[PDB]
């Protein structure tokens, strides 16, 4: 049937992929050794040998430590040994290294592995890519890989779950350079990009889950929950099914505006589950509050272009219609005038599954919400500002130039980013 | 004598068809295995209208299930009443239209239409006296709208003198299920208005209203909505399978409902509709059925007929009744509500009576009205279309499939033309 291929690159991508594959194995009842103790999961797992299910995944990094952690973990006997590809020297937070110097050494091997995995599929629908903007390997190799993919396939859809840089929290100094360069070179080679912020997830964990020590495991578990809710309609059946193509058809009004924001509900802890009834109306309301968005940007500062809702479990379509109508009448949210109908809904029968030892309580229904809004324009502006601050004095430029990146490229990227900002300002004005 | 071929496109069409075939099989006394286990000879008297006959008493419904993605009818095959269908009638694609009208009309439909037409032709060759075709689809999705329009065009080319009925699901006025839903709808009508003999418009919001307010259902699912739609579908064509005092087949309904070729959109209804808590508080009679049929609340399209004037009306009664009662009820309704009927057509109503009641009910009635008020819905859609096409929103998705903006301009112009005609005739 329809098959999806997952690619995880860099430290963030690899760890998010680990969490995602643990979640899939738990949801489908597959043991960590590839055996089923007791079948629509052909979308993600292929059958090899006698009852062994191998995930359709590719794990790429230029540094072997995190992949080595994978190879010795609980899921050692789950992944194909050749699907875990490693380099020797990482990009070292240098976009040019992961794009021009180090990326080109293993890009061909990665493409060969992807082709071998894809030729098996008969109904391939698209690619899932997990990476981060700030990292060198992430941004550089992801940009190179998507350029190669768009050249090779073109028609198949390509999706990203990227980590947007936080407004205040940062873990690198060269972050704006890499972010701007990779956004400029990936703007024309993508179909939909869902972005999350570590700071926003920290706020979510502190405010709702009541966790004071949210390590990266919890963040990756939340992200994996969102990805699972996105792919559920493929992996199961419901009253209203949505595949990957409908996402880009409904959320992307123009080819240069494909940066929606992903939220989730209900994110509550075990003890507060007793005091709350998780009804469709209230979780739909919670999906639209600014305090629940997992990117540090206020929706009230802009207008929604398109919205997509995905419901799981015990859900009645009439309640969904009523809740969406109630949201529409409310004037706390704003919609562009040129988009009279701004909702795409999907309903699935399979309820979410709670990973044992986790932090989320057990619920019978859940909502995943994606919004394409101009409120992200502000974030773009901020990044550009930082770029300028560090480019008026040529700070750190020699590091990139010594790796084969001509200086004018930086200007090009900045110029393009400015144009993109103008784009948003043009579509945020009603007629 | 006559026989009807059923077509089934898209997810909405497939689910409605599954419910419809379950209802039909239960009506004729056929178990899910396809073996007749009824009690009355009238079940087999005209069973050839919908079911073939295979060696061994097994009955194969004369249906074709089409989709561009395999999930929906994979579930259909796995679930109950999946072994009843002949597996050669399941036509699947791998990609799926992705809510893109152009993709389902020019690229994927272009690939699947040859196989679908081969199946249709093979199924219809065994027909003795083909009466027409039935199609179930929705105007919002890509697969439904695009491939349905393509199939309808090809069939109308192949069988110009036959009958085509469509049970469409028109977009709701309050809450949409798709962002690009305006575009497709308009692009659909520009074909439908030219190729379909009659179309019955169904709105999900009206069905929600009926289920909540009248049936008192707290949790109405798509199962109940498709149950109601299947009840209407069965009521429409009941005169072809059972004897009655006054008969009416598809051709006669078409003759009575299209004063002009470009106006073939009607709003269906049903009666009686009561819950399991208040059904013993009301005695159902012909006046009760008539009063429930002529209720703006009971209409299955979210469009108030009181804002316009009826052109023609059809009432199909089921059960044992008195012709005098039906005639006096129609005369009374026409006299009281004479402000909602066009003056240039006397005796707007056409009645049919079928002796055999629905299995379990004492009596029932199906209402089909051709009101000018539908123009409202039409103009609303046009408005939204313009609100997008002024800014070229989502236009690249369609134009990357080979379509050009002149097609959108033509569709909008024809849409406005139809709205103007509906306004003039009022």
């Amino acid at each position: 049937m329809r098959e999806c291929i997952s690619i995880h690159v860099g430290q963030a991508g690899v760890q998010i992929g680990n969490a995602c594959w643990e979640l899939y194995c738990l949801e489908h009842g597959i043991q960590p050794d590839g055996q089923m103790p007791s079948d629509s999961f052909n979308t993600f797992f292929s059958e090899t040998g006698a009852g062994k299910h191998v995930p359709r995944a590719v794990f790429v990094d230029l540094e072997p430590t995190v992949i080595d952690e994978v190879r010795t973990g609980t899921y050692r006997q789950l992944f194909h040994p050749e699907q875990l590809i490693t380099g020797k020297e990482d990009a070292a937070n240098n976009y040019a290294r992961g794009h021009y110097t180090i990326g080109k050494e293993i890009i061909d091997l990665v493409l060969d592995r992807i082709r071998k995995l894809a030729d098996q599929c008969t109904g391939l629908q698209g690619f899932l890519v997990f990476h981060s903007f700030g990292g060198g390997t992430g941004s550089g190799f992801t940009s190179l890989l998507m350029e190669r993919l768009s050249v090779d396939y073109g028609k198949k859809s390509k999706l990203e779950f990227s980590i947007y840089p936080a407004p205040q929290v940062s873990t690198a100094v060269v972050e704006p350079y890499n972010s701007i360069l990779t956004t400029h070179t990936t703007l024309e080679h993508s179909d939909c990009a869902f972005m999350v912020d570590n700071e926003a997830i920290y706020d979510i964990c502190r405010r709702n889950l009541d966790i004071e020590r949210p390590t990266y495991t919890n963040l990756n578990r939340l992200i994996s929950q969102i990805v699972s809710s996105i792919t559920a309609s493929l992996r199961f059946d419901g009253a209203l099914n949505v595949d990957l193509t409908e996402f880009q058809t409904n959320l992307v009004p123009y080819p240069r505006i494909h940066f929606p924001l992903a939220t989730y509900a209900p994110v509550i802890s075990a003890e507060k589950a007793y005091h709350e009834q998780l009804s469709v109306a209230e979780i739909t309301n919670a999906c639209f509050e600014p305090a629940n968005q997992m990117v540090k940007c206020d929706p009230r500062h802009g207008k929604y272009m398109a919205c997509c809702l995905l419901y799981r479990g015990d859900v009645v379509p009439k309640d969904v219609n009523a809740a969406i109508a109630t949201i529409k009448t409310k004037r706390s949210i704003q919609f562009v005038d040129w988009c009279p109908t701004g909702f795409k809904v999907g309903i699935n029968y399979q309820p979410p599954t709670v990973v044992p030892g986790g932090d989320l309580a057990k619920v019978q229904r859940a909502v995943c919400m994606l919004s394409n809004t101009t409120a992200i324009a502000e974030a773009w502006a901020r990044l550009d500002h930082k770029f300028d601050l560090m480019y008026a004095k040529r700070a750190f430029v020699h590091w990139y130039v010594g790796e084969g990146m001509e200086e004018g490229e930086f200007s090009e990227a900045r110029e393009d980013m400015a144009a993109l900002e103008k784009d948003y300002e043009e579509v945020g004005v009603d007629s | 004598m006559r026989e009807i071929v059923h077509i089934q496109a898209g997810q909405c069409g497939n689910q409605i068809g599954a419910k419809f075939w379950e209802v039909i099989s239960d009506e004729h006394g056929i178990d899910p295995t396809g073996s007749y286990h009824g009690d009355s000879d009238l079940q087999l008297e005209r069973i050839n209208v919908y079911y073939n006959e295979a060696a061994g008493n097994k009955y194969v419904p004369r249906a074709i299930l089409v989709d561009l993605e395999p999930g929906t009818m994979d579930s259909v095959r796995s679930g109950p009443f999946g072994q009843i269908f002949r597996p050669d009638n399941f036509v699947f694609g791998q990609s799926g239209a992705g809510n893109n009208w152009a993709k389902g009309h020019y690229t994927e439909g272009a690939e699947l239409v040859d196989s679908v037409l081969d199946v249709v032709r093979k199924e219809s060759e065994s027909c003795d006296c083909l009466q027409g075709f039935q199609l179930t689809h929705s105007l919002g999705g890509g697969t439904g709208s695009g491939m349905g329009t393509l199939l309808i065009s090809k069939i109308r080319e192949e069988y110009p003198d036959r009958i085509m009925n469509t049970f469409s699901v028109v977009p709701s006025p309050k809450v949409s299920d798709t962002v690009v839903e305006p575009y497709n709808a308009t692009l659909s009508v520009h074909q439908l208005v030219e190729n379909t003999d009659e179309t019955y418009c169904i709105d999900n919001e009206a069905l929600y209203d009926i289920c909540f307010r009248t049936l008192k259902l707290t949790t109405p699912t798509y199962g109940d909505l498709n149950h109601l739609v299947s009840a209407t579908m069965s009521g429409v064509t009941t005169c072809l399978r059972f004897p009655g005092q006054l008969n009416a087949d598809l051709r006669k309904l078409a003759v009575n409902m299209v004063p002009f070729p470009r106006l073939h959109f009607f709003m269906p209804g049903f009666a009686p509709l009561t819950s399991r808590g208040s059904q013993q508080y009301r005695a159902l009679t012909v006046p009760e059925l008539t009063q429930q049929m002529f209720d703006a609340k009971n209409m299955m399209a979210a469009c108030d007929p009181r804002h316009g004037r009826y052109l023609t009306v059809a009432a199909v009664f089921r059960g044992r009744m008195s012709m005098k009662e039906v005639d006096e009820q129609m005369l009374n309704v026409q006299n009281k509500n004479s402000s909602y009927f066009v003056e240039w057509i006397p005796n707007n109503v056409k009645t049919a009576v079928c002796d055999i009641p629905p299995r379990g009910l004492k009596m029932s009635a199906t209402f089909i009205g051709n009101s000018t008020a539908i123009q409202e819905l039409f103009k609303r859609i046009s408005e939204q279309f313009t609100a997008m096409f002024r800014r070229k929103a989502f236009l690249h998705w369609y134009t990357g499939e080979g379509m050009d903006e002149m097609e959108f301009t033509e569709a909008e112009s024809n849409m406005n033309d139809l709205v103007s005609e509906y306004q003039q005739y009022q």
Binding site: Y254, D423 | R390, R391, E405
Partner: peptide, 10 residues
């Protein structure tokens, strides 16, 4: 983006 092209459409 060419969102201003068809604003003159009737």
């Amino acid at each position: 983006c060419g969102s201003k092209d068809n604003i003159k459409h009737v």
